[PDB]
Specification:
heterodimer; A: 225 residues; mainly beta; Green Fluorescent Protein; 2% helix; B: 227 residues; 1 helix; binds the ligand *C(=O)O[C@H]1CCCCCc2c1nnn2*; fluorescent protein; Fluorescence
Chain lengths: 225, 227
């Protein structure tokens, strides 16, 4: 595709999230860069409103699947780069088992040379002193295949997948993800055959950063064809 | 500790493993470097005998907890660096649920300026078309925080923990780990209060390497004590 040409080389990234979980309002801003040729992303996120009222790991999935490395024989199945530069809308419902739900809506698009992810997040029905609002999750992120399928009727894609957040006592907090993406622009996009994305993620801290924050390194590849 | 002084800066690492799984002998050699100040390890491992007869992810835990980043308030709980340069013995039993068992014995010590992990591994009772010998595990590595306790009777530490390996069909292969570490030398070591290590790992391939191999990037930190 012509949109793929925008991801040769290193691309700067900006992420903006405005959030409300059980009435706790917050904002996150992230910056960094992406190298789709190697499937590599490096970002630093800051909570600009003070302390994050939820664990950082619970926002990883919400906080740019266009930086996935598609091998040569699968280039024609890359919807995400296909929609660029005009971009796509990404919406999810994330259901935390025995706890609350996030609903997210993002626009992912180029603004000049920068790939921008602007997100609104609303969370409801979280338990005070549950794993989320009680901050009981380990600072890490487990890797599992995310299966992508075409959504012909919306000219886009969908995905449903399960994230398992490790809990401080050795238990597991399931977060069921339901995802739909659709192009912002008109003009042709690539609708894929079934395949998957695989991401390996490292969460860390900048020792000089005083604000509540997350440093994130990811390596993402597509396979399954 | 005085041994922690050896881990300011970047330290070269050598890993040597001699293995026998169900009678199938193999060897692995790894090289790279560790930066305990940032909890960062980068290594490349090669199977020097040809094709690895087990999946690479099953050897991750066997293939240097002395590179963990202990924060300032927890420095007195770092047994691993405390035993250096003379080092420690690290022994495990790894039970693969409904499958075989690895038994490992390693020495982790300085030889000159290089931190060296030399390991012998014996594996028994594996199923020939089970997840291990049948190569059915995904090329990745998920982990939970590993809880460390003192083992005062051995002047060292122990840990018991679970690794869950993703299987190609969507199932999970559990590997139950039992670990004991004891110092090689006679000098004083640090015996910790209960805490945990958190390791996050990325597995990859070097596109120019022709041998069967694993590139490994890890970030490791200690936490779980307030003070
Ligand atoms: C903690 O044990 O996490 C496990 C949960 C069960 C196995 C499948 C989900 C998984 C795990 N690790 N990462 N994903």
């Amino acid at each position: 595709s012509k949109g793929e040409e925008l991801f040769t080389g290193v691309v700067p990234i900006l992420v903006e999230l405005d959030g409300d979980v059980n009435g706790h309002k917050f904002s996150v801003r992230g910056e960094g860069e992406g190298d789709a040729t190697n499937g590599k992303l490096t970002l630093k996120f800051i909570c600009t409103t003070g302390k994050l009222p939820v664990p950082w790991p619970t926002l990883v999935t919400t906080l740019v699947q266009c930086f996935s490395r598609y091998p040569d024989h699968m280039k024609r199945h890359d919807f995400f780069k296909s929609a660029m530069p005009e971009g796509y809308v990404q919406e999810r419902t994330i259901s935390f088992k025995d706890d609350g739900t996030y609903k997210t809506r993002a626009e992912v698009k180029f603004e000049g040379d920068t790939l921008v992810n602007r997100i609104e997040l609303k969370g409801i029905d979280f338990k005070e002193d549950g794993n989320i609002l009680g901050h009981k999750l380990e600072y890490n992120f487990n890797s599992f295949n995310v299966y992508i399928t075409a959504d012909k009727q919306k000219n886009g894609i969908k995905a449903n997948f399960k994230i398992r957040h490790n809990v401080e006592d050795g238990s597991v907090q399931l977060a069921d993800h339901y995802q739909q993406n659709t192009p912002i622009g008109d003009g042709p996009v690539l609708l894929p055959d079934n395949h998957y994305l695989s991401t390996q993620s490292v969460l860390s801290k900048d020792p000089n950063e005083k604000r509540d924050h997350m440093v994130l390194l990811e390596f993402v590849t597509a396979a399954g064809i």
